Amino acid sequence: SMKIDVVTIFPEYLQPVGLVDVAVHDLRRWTSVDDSPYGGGPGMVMKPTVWGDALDEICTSETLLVVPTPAGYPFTQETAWQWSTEDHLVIACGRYEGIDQRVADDAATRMRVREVSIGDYVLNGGEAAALVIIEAVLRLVPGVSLLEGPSYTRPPSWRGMDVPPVLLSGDHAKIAAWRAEQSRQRTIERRPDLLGFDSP
Amino acid sequence: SMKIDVVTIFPEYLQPVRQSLPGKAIDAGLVDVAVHDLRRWTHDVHKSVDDSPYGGGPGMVMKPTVWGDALDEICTSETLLVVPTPAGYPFTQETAWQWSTEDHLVIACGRYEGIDQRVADDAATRMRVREVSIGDYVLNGGEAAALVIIEAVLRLVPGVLGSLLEGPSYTRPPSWRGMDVPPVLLSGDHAKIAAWRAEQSRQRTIERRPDLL
Ligand SMILES: N#Cc1c(-c2ccc3ccn(Cc4cccnc4O)c3c2)n[nH]c1N
Ligand SMILES: N#Cc1c(-c2ccc3ccn(Cc4cccnc4O)c3c2)n[nH]c1N
Q1: What is the DSSP string of A85-101?
Q2: Superfamily of segment(s) A145-200
Q3: Which atom belonging to ligand 1 lies closest to the Cα atom of A72?
Q4: Which of A12, B8, B47, B197 meets the CB 3.0–4.6 Å disulfide criterion with B42?
Q5: Coil, helix or strand for B75?
Q6: d(CA B168, nearest CA chain A) in Å
Q7: For adenine, which residues are the binding ones (chain A) (predicted)?
C-alpha cells in the first residue's frame, strides 16, 4: 500500500493521474513564491518559506521526499524498484530555475530526501518528471540489463514485409537465440554503455 | 513554426501539453499540438489495437495495419517520426536542440509490449524515423515519454512555452530555519562567487554523476 503526494504550483498539469492513492496539492495554498538568486544569475528561485510550510503539513519522518531536478542523482529502474515498497512518497515539483537548496537540506534533518533526474535533458519544471516517476514506480508495487528486441504480430506478411521466419517456426530454442541476438545487436548499436563500451 | 501530432490510445494523457501552451504562441502560429486517438484507424467493431506476439511470450503487440493507416494519413515525407521505446537511442538535450527546428514531429505512442517493428521499418523507407528512450527505467507506454519530449523540445523554440551539474541555488530570506545563505553569495565579489559556484558544481558532479567525468 502506497500513498503519493505531489506538490506543485501547476496542479492542472498532473491530471493524467486501491493499493495506491495519489493526491495533488497546489503549493499556493500555503502562501510571490519566487525571487532573484543570491549571487546573481538568470531567472528566479523558489523561496524556501512556502515549501517549508507545505512539507511540514504533508510529510512525516517516514516520508521519502522526492525532488526532481536536472542536477539530481539518476532515477533508474533500480530506483523504481527501491521506491516501490515505500509507504509514502512526496514529490516536490519545482518551477522557475528550481527550489532554494535549504528546502531539501531542512527536510533531510527530519526525513529521507532524494534529489533525482529522469534524464539528460532540461524541462521547465518537475511535473513531467513526477509523472514519469509515478508511472515507473507504480507498475512495480506489490500487487500490480539489455535492450528489448523487435516484436511482431499478425499478419505474417504486411506491405511485402515478412515477420522473421524463425518466429513462425515454433522452435523455442531457435526463437530464444534469435531474440538474444537481436537484443545484443540493438544494445551495441544504441546503448553500448550498457555493455561497458564507450558512448558514441 | 512547428506542428506536433501525437497518436495514442490515451489522448487524455496529453492534456497537460495543451494546458502548457501559451495562447500568444498559438495565435502567432508558432506551434500547434494535435492529439489523435489511434482507435480512429481500427478496422473492426471491437476497435482492436493489439494482438499476440509471434514467437510467443508475455504481453501483446500493437497491430501494424492500424498504425500503418494512422501514420499514412498523418505523416508526409518531411515528417520526423518519433517513436518512444525502452529500446531506443537516448533522447538527450542535443536531440531536443536538433528537433526544435523541425517543421513537423509525429510522436507514435505505444502501449503493451510496443508496436510491430514493421511499422517503423516501413515508415523509415520514406521519412526520417527516430526510436528514442527518455531514460533507463520502464514505463507502461509512450505517453509520458511524449510529454517529456514535447516539453524539452518546445522550451527550445523561441517564445513557445513562455558537462557539469548545476550547484545549489538560494534566494530570500537570508536566514531560514537556522540555515544561512552562503556568505560568499552576498559578498559582491563576483569572481569569487563564480569560483565558488564552479567548485560546488564540481563537487556535486563527482558525487551524483561521476559518469560525466
Ligand atoms: N527530474 C528532472 C529534470 C528537470 C527539471 C526538474 C525540476 C525542475 C524545476 C525547474 N526546472 C527548470 C530548471 C531547473 C534548474 C535549472 N534550470 C532550469 O530551467 C526543472 C527541471 N529537467 N530535466 C530533468 N531530467
Ligand atoms: N521512451 C521511452 C520509455 C518507455 C516506453 C516507451 C514506449 C512504450 C510502449 C509500451 N511500453 C511498455 C513496454 C515496452 C516494452 C516492454 N515492456 C513494456 O512494459 C513502452 C515503454 N519505457 N521506458 C522508457 N524510457
Answers
A1: T-SEEEEE---TT-B-H
A2: tRNA(m1g37)methyltransferase, domain 2 (1.10.1270.20)
A3: 1
A4: B47
A5: coil
A6: 6
A7: 118-119, 121, 123
